[PDB]
Design a protein around this ligand. Structure first.
Ligand code: DHE
Ligand code: DHE
Ligand code: HEC
Ligand code: HEC
Lengths: 514, 514
């Protein structure tokens, strides 16, 4: 057991110094030792550190985000310097053992045990901390900090409006009961090594029946019981591509959305460019429909009518329209460079009719795609208009049926001021340019990167919440703006609020209000 | 580039001395250098041969079944001594290039151009020769010897009764027109590295629309146009198992049968134990239903009513009943050791009603499973009776609706006499023991292994054809018996008849007459 220029020793040691890498350095440091937003563990940045320094750093840790014997550390040190490993296959045993039922279905209350205005609660992600903050929308006070998995990507609500599903990027799901005295974890499970999406069944006759979770590694998605989180089925997404029709060993599972028209899960499988329609009717025998879209599928959401899944194929610069009723690809609308909608933004255009919008990453723009074939067939599935935001590097854009301004964030732009503000449009005059809201400046944080991410409204549609994403150590905040006035309403600040990313309003998430 | 005790040299050479192994030593010598019925190429039987002898043997060949420069031979010699390789991924380019249209659909005749009694022709496989013999059923004369791929496993008829599909174990399919002056190849294609089954669409509204072929390597099946053999879709079978629900990197595609009730292909995926129902309605978007059966699925066939696919799960010692109408697993009937039906044998029992039978490999016996839930529900999906053949190592068993004797071969039994004869039962008295027919002795071949394989009837149901499978060099024959008399009718002998294995009667294969 040898690499291209670092300590080489054999056997057994390879298998174990790497099983110790996937211990609690799997989700933190990556699958192929990548390491987004932190400093890399790629063979060369680490070989430069050395056989002496690496032992030291692993042994005492560091103060920005750091149990093992001297022998296991000497190991990890000579072995992170080695050729990159063979990522484990996470099957049913590994998944059924990680399954822990913290509270039984009968032990759980029949009705609410708190004064909490549940539909107006915010499930805020605390990335680097590996927890979620249950912030109140009126009092602007953190009601409860719950211990979850690492870097909770998204939070989904169980259609009923009772349970809160949260998934870590380390593939650890946690179910939370919002009806308990103090809302705490009632079930947990690890569905892979690295994941992104969790989702519950939301069709007519199944509200909360099954829970699905998509994984980045292994290329699979796992279906569970939507009450106890009991693994029932696991399906591999390894297969042939849509473009070149060739084999691909790692087609990652991206976004998932429950079909409201049929008993299915609409699963975005990235690299292959196939949107899977996973029928659950008969679960011990799965029926999957492989709808070819466009390569590199990513995020997206529902249109105004909950019929069309508007997904972004980012490295193809197209938006795929999935018809959830007729179960086919409606069109591959060509949009600008690297589209990134999140769930998207739905409003009613005066001169074009009901639309769905998306901000971009390579380009800027906000493409307006028509979502109505019945009353506006000449505009549906075309980039009819086009608006212009501050610049590239945009992740989300938001709107609400209650009132008027359209918000587009720009989290990853090199221009400091742009990456610390949002472009607010007025729908009642689209030819009018945006108003730059100094979100991060209003926060009064002082020093840091102060990146502005995700515009998330409250139930009522009067407030718009922002996350000022700043380093683990730096002062981070949540900025609340009044939609009608366009002025600052409040700033939620706290040291427990370590790296706030995604904020999910319970009602708005549950009823898909975007 | 080094192994555990043989010449080691680097780079480039690994990739090429192995691309030359998959040249024309892929189908002949195996995927992982296995090598059924010939002497192995496993690292140790070959390392013992030596760096000097291997160069010699590859350079001059041998007289029992054997272009490259001295450098490429020196290569192959140092490199077959190396660690076993990384089997290529055969995608769409490699498959679309291998596609050759030898005759256009318009160039082909509107009606027959020969005196041939097409429904009573035998497509006989000549294994080691890599060809098929079109033997006549009345005159017992080879009408045409056609050049195909290596070791043509099965031969399937296009529902119409016009085209003859033949697939090599080297995954080379060849379509043959039986209406041409001299029936020759009208289309060919290579769908993988190693395959077994080919099949055409046989449901009500699709007779000859699409052609499917299952592969052992890569774990996939390819769907083509049933007229021109145009690759349209390729699907990977790599996935989770049914028993332990764990990942498996090589679930081999075994038997395939076209559903006569729905627009589907019933695909047996071995290792995973999943019987796939591949819907073709909309081909650019495939709907697959994963019906869990029992691990290690293999062969099988239809019942009397063409409704139930009776497949054998050999290393599970069960027979899975697939309902092609209601689209579910009907039952997992427990049978004896290592079941091997082929397509099976269907007859009407006097005291139990319509049944399906299967001979075995580990055990002997012929298990009788009831195939009627309507008139005989108390016997359906149970091993009601049980008959006894000569011994273990049995591959096929046959019967015909016209007349009375049931034949069970035994090709792989150590007892020479047993492996050279067939057990003939009388259905009109099942308590009566079998009559041992000295098939290979009647052939008058003299020296050899003289293995008896596959009882195949003629259209009329009066003759029963056997294949006396003897070595490439030895004298091989086809023995024809008269079913009514149980005596010898004729013996087809010829030197072109090198290793006769599977004999397929055109009408009997087409209309699934077993
Ligand atoms: C597949 C996917 C979804 C859709 C889920 C769904 O709705 O079913 C999604 C949505 C999301 C949403 C959902 C918002 C919504 O309301 O729609 C949030 C909060 C979010 C926070 C982040 N995303 Fe996300 N995102 C990825 C994956 C995804 N992001 C990546 O792979 C990527 C590009 C790289 C990575 O490092 O993981 C990435 C980076 C980020 C971030 O950097 C964020 C800001 C911080 C973080 O935690 O990593 N992503
Ligand atoms: C999956 C499969 C089928 C069903 C196809 C269908 O109907 O869709 C089948 C049927 C068949 C049938 C179909 C007969 C029928 O009418 O049902 C034939 C002729 C046949 C000749 C052989 N079979 Fe076969 N057979 C395999 C695979 C299969 N055999 C193997 O993998 C195995 C065990 C090992 C191997 O070496 O390939 C194997 C060995 C053999 C032989 O040794 C035979 C006698 C000679 C040869 O050519 O290799 N198999
Ligand atoms: C588990 C056995 C491991 C291994 C192999 C390493 N880590 Fe971590 N790591 C993480 C963070 C946030 C940092 C950056 C902040 C800081 O250093 O304070 C790091 C950095 C490292 C390095 C050094 C990088 C360099 O400068 O070259 C190395 C060699 C390293 N880690 C190895 C995060 C985490 C955790 C997230 C809380 C956890 C747990 C781990 N690391 C675990 C391990
Ligand atoms: C392609 C580049 C190759 C390689 C690597 C080899 N063969 Fe063949 N082989 C086949 C048969 C039928 C035999 C047995 C009969 C006989 O030897 O006459 C063999 C045997 C070998 C051996 C030697 C086995 C031993 O005694 O140790 C080796 C080293 C070997 N082959 C290498 C069949 C075929 C073919 C089927 C017609 C083809 C073509 C190839 N072999 C091609 C190659």
């Amino acid at each position: 057991v040898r690499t291209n220029g670092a300590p080489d020793m054999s056997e057994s040691e390879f298998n174990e110094a790497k099983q110790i890498y996937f211990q609690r350095c799997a989700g933190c440091h990556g699958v192929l030792r990548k390491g987004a937003t932190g400093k890399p563990l790629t063979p060369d940045i680490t070989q430069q550190r050395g056989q002496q320094y690496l032992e030291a750093l692993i042994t005492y840790g560091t103060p920005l985000g750091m149990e093992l014997s001297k022998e296991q550390i000497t190991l990890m040190a000579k072995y992170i310097q080695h050729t990159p490993p063979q990522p484990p296959e996470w099957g049913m045993p590994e998944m059924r053992e990680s399954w822990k039922v913290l509270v039984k279905p009968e032990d759980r209350p029949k009705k609410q045990l708190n004064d909490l205005d549940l539909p107006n609660l915010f499930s805020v992600t605390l990335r680097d901390a590996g927890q979620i903050a249950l912030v109140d929308g009126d009092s602007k006070k953190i009601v409860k900090v719950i211990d979850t998995g690492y870097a909770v990507h998204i939070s989904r609500m169980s259609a009923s409006g009772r349970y809160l599903l949260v998934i870590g990027r380390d593939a650890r799901i946690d179910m939370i009961d919002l009806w308990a005295k103090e809302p705490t974890k009632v079930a947990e499970i690890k569905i892979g090594i690295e994941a992104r999406s969790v989702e519950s069944s939301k069709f007519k006759g199944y509200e909360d029946r099954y829970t699905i979770a998509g994984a980045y590694w292994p290329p699979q998605f796992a279906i569970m019981d939507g009450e106890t989180l009991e693994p029932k089925q696991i399906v591999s997404t390894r297969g042939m591509t849509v473009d070149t029709q060739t084999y691909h060993p790692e087609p990652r599972v991206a976004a998932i959305i429950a079909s409201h028209e049929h008993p299915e899960f609409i699963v975005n499988v990235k690299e292959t460019g196939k949107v899977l329609l996973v029928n659950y009717k008969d679960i011990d025998n799965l029926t999957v429909t492989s709808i070819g879209a466009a390569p590199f599928l990513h995020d997206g959401g529902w249109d105004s009518s909950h019929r069309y899944f508007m997904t972004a194929a980012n490295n193809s610069n197209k938006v795929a329209v999935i018809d959830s009723k007729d179960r086919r690809l409606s069109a591959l609308v060509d949009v600008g460079k690297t589209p990134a909608p999140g769930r998207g933004a739905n409003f009613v255009h005066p001169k074009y009719g009901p639309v769905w919008s998306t901000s971009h990453l390579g380009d800027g723009s906000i493409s307006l795609i028509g979502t109505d074939p019945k009353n506006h067939p000449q505009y549906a599935w075309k980039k009819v208009a086009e608006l212009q935001g501050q610049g590239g590097g945009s992740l989300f854009i938001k709107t609400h049926p209650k009132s008027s301004h359209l918000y587009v964030d720009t989290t990853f732009n090199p221009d400091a001021r742009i990456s610390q503000s949002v472009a607010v449009f007025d729908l009642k005059n689209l030819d009018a340019k945006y108003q730059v809201l100094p979100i991060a400046e209003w926060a009064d944080l002082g020093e840091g990167a102060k990146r502005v991410v995700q515009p998330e409204y409250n139930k009522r549609g009067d407030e718009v919440w922002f996350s000022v994403w700043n380093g683990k150590n730096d002062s981070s905040a949540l900025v609340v703006v009044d939609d009608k006035t366009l002025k600052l309403k409040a700033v939620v600040k706290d040291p427990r609020l370590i790296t706030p990313t995604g904020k999910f309003n319970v009602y708005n998430t549950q009823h898909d209000v975007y």
